[PDB]
Amino acid sequence: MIPTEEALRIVFGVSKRLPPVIVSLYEALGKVLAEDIRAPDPLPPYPASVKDGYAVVASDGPGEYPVITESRAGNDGLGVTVTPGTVAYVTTGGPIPDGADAVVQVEDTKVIGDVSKRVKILIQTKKGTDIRRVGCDIEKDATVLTTGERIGASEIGLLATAGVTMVKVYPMPIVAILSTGDELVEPTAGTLGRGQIRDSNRAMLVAAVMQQQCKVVDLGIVRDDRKELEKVLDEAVSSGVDIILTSGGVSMGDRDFVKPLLEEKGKVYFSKVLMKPGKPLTFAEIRAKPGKTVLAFGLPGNPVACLVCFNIFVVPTIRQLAGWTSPHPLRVRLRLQEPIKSDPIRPEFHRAIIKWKDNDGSGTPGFVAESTGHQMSSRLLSMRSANALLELPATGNVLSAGSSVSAIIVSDISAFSID
Amino acid sequence: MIPTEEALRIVFGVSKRLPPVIVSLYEALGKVLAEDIRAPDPLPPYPASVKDGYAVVASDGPGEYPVITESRAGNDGLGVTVTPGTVAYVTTGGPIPDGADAVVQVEDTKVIGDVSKRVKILIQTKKGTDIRRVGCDIEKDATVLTTGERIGASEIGLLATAGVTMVKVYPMPIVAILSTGDELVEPTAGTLGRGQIRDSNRAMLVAAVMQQQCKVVDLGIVRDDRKELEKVLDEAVSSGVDIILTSGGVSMGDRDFVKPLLEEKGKVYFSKVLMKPGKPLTFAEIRAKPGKTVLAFGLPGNPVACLVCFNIFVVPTIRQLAGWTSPHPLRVRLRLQEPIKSDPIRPEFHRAIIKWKDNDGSGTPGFVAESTGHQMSSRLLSMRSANALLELPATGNVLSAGSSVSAIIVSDISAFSID
Numbered sequence: 001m002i003p004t005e006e007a008l009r010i011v012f013g014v015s016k017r018l019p020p021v022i023v024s025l026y027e028a029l030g031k032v033l034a035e036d037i038r039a040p041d042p043l044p045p046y047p048a049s050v051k052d053g054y055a056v057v058a059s060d061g062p063g064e065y066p067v068i069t070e071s072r073a074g075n076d077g078l079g080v081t082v083t084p085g086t087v088a089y090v091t092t093g094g095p096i097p098d099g100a101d102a103v104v105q106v107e108d109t110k111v112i113g114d115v116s117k118r119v120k121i122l123i124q125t126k127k128g129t130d131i132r133r134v135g136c137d138i139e140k141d142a143t144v145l146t147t148g149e150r151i152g153a154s155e156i157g158l159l160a161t162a163g164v165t166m167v168k169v170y171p172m173p174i175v176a177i178l179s180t181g182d183e184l185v186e187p188t189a190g191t192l193g194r195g196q197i198r199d200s201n202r203a204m205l206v207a208a209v210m211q212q213q214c215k216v217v218d219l220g221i222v223r224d225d226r227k228e229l230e231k232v233l234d235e236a237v238s239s240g241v242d243i244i245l246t247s248g249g250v251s252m253g254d255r256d257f258v259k260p261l262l263e264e265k266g267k268v269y270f271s272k273v274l275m276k277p278g279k280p281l282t283f284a285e286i287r288a289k290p291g292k293t294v295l296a297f298g299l300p301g302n303p304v305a306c307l308v309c310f311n312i313f314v315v316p317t318i319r320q321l322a323g324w325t326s327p328h329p330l331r332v333r334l335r336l337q338e339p340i341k342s343d344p345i346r347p348e349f350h351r352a353i354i355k356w357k358d359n360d361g362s363g364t365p366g367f368v369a370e371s372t373g374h375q376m377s378s379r380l381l382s383m384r385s386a387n388a389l390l391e392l393p394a395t396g397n398v399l400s401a402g403s404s405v406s407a408i409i410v411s412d413i414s415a416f417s418i419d
Numbered sequence: 420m421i422p423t424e425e426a427l428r429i430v431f432g433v434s435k436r437l438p439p440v441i442v443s444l445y446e447a448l449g450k451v452l453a454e455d456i457r458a459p460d461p462l463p464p465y466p467a468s469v470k471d472g473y474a475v476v477a478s479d480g481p482g483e484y485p486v487i488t489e490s491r492a493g494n495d496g497l498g499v500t501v502t503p504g505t506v507a508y509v510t511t512g513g514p515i516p517d518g519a520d521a522v523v524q525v526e527d528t529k530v531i532g533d534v535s536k537r538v539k540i541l542i543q544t545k546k547g548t549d550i551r552r553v554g555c556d557i558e559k560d561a562t563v564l565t566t567g568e569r570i571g572a573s574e575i576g577l578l579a580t581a582g583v584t585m586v587k588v589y590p591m592p593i594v595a596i597l598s599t600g601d602e603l604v605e606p607t608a609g610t611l612g613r614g615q616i617r618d619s620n621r622a623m624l625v626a627a628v629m630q631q632q633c634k635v636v637d638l639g640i641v642r643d644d645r646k647e648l649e650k651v652l653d654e655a656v657s658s659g660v661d662i663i664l665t666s667g668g669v670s671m672g673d674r675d676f677v678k679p680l681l682e683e684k685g686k687v688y689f690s691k692v693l694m695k696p697g698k699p700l701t702f703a704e705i706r707a708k709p710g711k712t713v714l715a716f717g718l719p720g721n722p723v724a725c726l727v728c729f730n731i732f733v734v735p736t737i738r739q740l741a742g743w744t745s746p747h748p749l750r751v752r753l754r755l756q757e758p759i760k761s762d763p764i765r766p767e768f769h770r771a772i773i774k775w776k777d778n779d780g781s782g783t784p785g786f787v788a789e790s791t792g793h794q795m796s797s798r799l800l801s802m803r804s805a806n807a808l809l810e811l812p813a814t815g816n817v818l819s820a821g822s823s824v825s826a827i828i829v830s831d832i833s834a835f836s837i838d
């Protein structure tokens with residue numbers, strides 16, 4: 001039995017980033033860049049107006065002038081030179097005609113006459129005012145995005161600015177998922193027979209892998225039969241998947257075949273971890289027959305321990321495979337809203353609902369946590385709405401309300417319900 | 420011109436939750452529940468062993484006993500009664516045979532004899548030990564999920580436990596997106612002609628709407644022509660979409676038709692907001708010809724102001740339409756890593772890269788922020804990697820390094836890179 005910190009280190013040491021692929025612009029969203037992106041031209045590529053108004057010769061100053069051209073886009077004002085004593089109408093983003101060196105916004109002007117157009121400039125402007133010089137936002141050949149950067153909406157915007165519609169990125173791993181047990185029935189079952197339960201772990205894990213943006217290979221329910229589980233694992237290993245997730249069949253039962261089958265097919269690095277909830281967790285590396293590596297997690301059958309192990313061990317593995325330079329989850333410090341008894345031997349991953357408060361109890365703003373209640377590993381209601389795992393050390397003492405603890409954030413911090 | 424707080428309030432007051440729909444189990448992920456979910460049977464539905472070991476009569480105590488049955492699943496041990504002086508083998512999750520009232524884990528036992536099986540119980544156990552009574556995790560008819568609850572992986576697990584494979588939920592709004600401008604070209608363009616730029620806002624907004632899990636209707640580039648924009652808007656309004664996003668054509672230019680076209684098709688609630696970056700932002704409610712409501716955001720053309728307006732005003736609108744009871748973004752308090760000059764008139768949404776530190780500068784853990792640099796509205800590089808918008812009030816003073824500010828978190832807090 002090893003501590004969770006050592007188990008993570010082993011997983012990180014074994015897990016390798018996947019080979020990069022070439023995807024389309026919208027397929028690149030969520031993925032980590034596998035190449036630098038340089039701007040092929042400047043932004044703006046032409047001197048552009050910041051305002052709707054008039055392009056002027058700044059040294060002319062206030063006065064009445066003829067409007068010699070209008071410039072909004074493309075070739076507007078091409079070949080026209082704004083000389084001292086003249087102006088040109090411009091819209092925001094419009095190219096500045098040759099000779100003009102500043103822009104006066106329309107609110108600082110007044111149109112004069114009926115009908116040949118004439119305008120009164122009402123202020124004294126300075127050279128360069130309200131003009132974006134060539135490349136002031138992005139210089140030609142500047143690096144706008146770099147390898148290792150995760151692509152979000154503004155990064156998609158930067159790729160489109162630079163005219164990149166096919167992107168080199170690290171792909172997401174493909175994950176196979178199966179459940180084990182003679183007691184299981186499909187979640188479509190109505191009336192349950194004696195000694196039956198609905199398979200809940202498979203759909204839970206399929207959903208958790210979908211939240212990580214990975215393709216899922218659903219291998220269904222496998223019975224407690226060594227030859228049948230071996231066949232499904234052999235098929236999963238040769239199918240092309242990167243990660244295999246099983247649940248159940250890893251405790252001390254006489255028909256728990258996951259651990260010995262993974263020892264036979266590949267290298268098992270550990271099978272037991274010092275933690276609450278649970279204990280059994282097999283991690284193995286299998287080489288598929290040529291040729292590639294497949295990572296296997298023999299997750300515990302108890303629903304809570306199954307999901308807690310996914311959150312702590314599988315999520316950073318998916319991220320590492322997908323090329324994330326920072327795969328660790330966000331850890332914050334927070335205050336307890338109620339007392340919690342820690343375990344004397346096992347450090348706990350206590351499920352909690354956390355929120356940011358203007359006063360965390362100590363007079364200053366901060367995160368606070370409420371327990372989800374009874375933490376029994378068979379009680380999936382303890383995972384309901386839980387957005388964090390409080391890391392409670394094995395002191396055996398009662399941590400009182402108001403004391404501070406470390407907490408792992410497990411669900412999108414930007415989707416957090418406010419206080 | 421109105422403050423951002425009033426503009427949000429108007430948007431919230433106009434925005435209505437969409438009619439609920441019935442979806443499949445995996446389509447329900449990410450969606451808000453539109454009905455309560457009750458367990459049709461208890462969990463476990465039979466008295467279940469917590470351990471791999473032996474089901475005993477607790478009052479027998481340590482001694483040697485015959486193993487009268489084996490119970491792992493279904494009908495194992497049906498009709499067998501464990502009487503005082505006998506035991507039954509059990510695996511974790513196995514049904515407890517009639518008559519047994521406790522379980523002794525296999526580590527507290529020893530198999531005796533060769534071959535009729537016999538086992539030595541090594542401890543004195545207490546009635547009920549290591550048995551999950553019927554319904555101890557979930558009681559029959561208990562409410563496991565309620566209306567207004569967002570479905571994550573554990574909620575999918577709870578639906579599968581309860582045998583629910585078709586779920587009533589609030590759907591995501593469908594969003595139409597278009598760009599405006601005679602200066603625009605597609606992001607596939609190579610060499611740009613004079614007075615041209617690649618359309619970056621459309622792909623940026625498509626990606627931002629994909630991050631919010633909404634279907635996108637891409638309406639392309641529309642030119643600065645009143646009749647053409649009217650036709651595209653009329654087609655978008657009658658297409659069945661819930662939200663229309665345009666960008667550009669909302670400043671003071673003589674060919675900026677978005678605002679007057681939205682005034683003509685529906686009700687414009689506001690067109691100008693006191694904020695940095697930007698100023699123009701049109702919000703309108705259109706009634707489609709029978710019949711349903713369509714919300715329109717005339718977003719600014721400047722890339723930064725376009726995305727900032729999406730993050731602050733469009734994201735909570737999508738969430739409200741999708742039935743979120745808490746659509747507001749997460750706001751935290753944090754310390755500045757460097758000095759920042761606030762504006763004298765406009766409150767700023769200053770882009771920043773934030774992270775949680777063990778020491779935020781004041782000796783206690785907390786969030787800290789670095790500016791993304793120059794905040795010019797034309798500079799999309801100021802949005803690069805920005806996971807927060809610092810809310811800097813309009814005091815005109817220099818906020819020094821180490822001072823505290825409010826910050827809006829705009830990208831998945833659980834995807835935050837650690838310090």
Ligand SMILES: Nc1ncnc2c1ncn2[C@@H]1O[C@H](COP(=O)(O)O)[C@@H](O)[C@H]1O
Nearest residue numbers: 092093598619620667668669670720721
């Ligand atoms: N789709 C777009 N992508 C990039 N820049 C844009 C887009 N639409 C408008 N702009 C720019 O944003 C500024 C304001 O646009 P407008 O309100 O149409 O004058 C101008 O500098 C435009 O060139």
Ligand SMILES: Nc1ncnc2c1ncn2[C@@H]1O[C@H](COP(=O)(O)O)[C@@H](O)[C@H]1O
Nearest residue numbers: 179200201248249250251301302511512
């Ligand atoms: N797919 C599953 N869904 C729900 N419960 C499970 C699943 N697989 C195993 N279990 C339960 O988890 C516990 C441990 O499983 P095992 O390691 O196979 O003994 C038992 O109580 C099982 O009935």
Ligand SMILES: [Cl-]
Nearest residue numbers: 276277278377
């Ligand atoms: Cl436990």
Ligand SMILES: [Cl-]
Nearest residue numbers: 695696697796
């Ligand atoms: Cl601005």
Ligand SMILES: [Mg+2]
Nearest residue numbers: 180181248249
């Ligand atoms: Mg089992």
Ligand SMILES: [Mg+2]
Nearest residue numbers: 599600667668
């Ligand atoms: Mg325009």
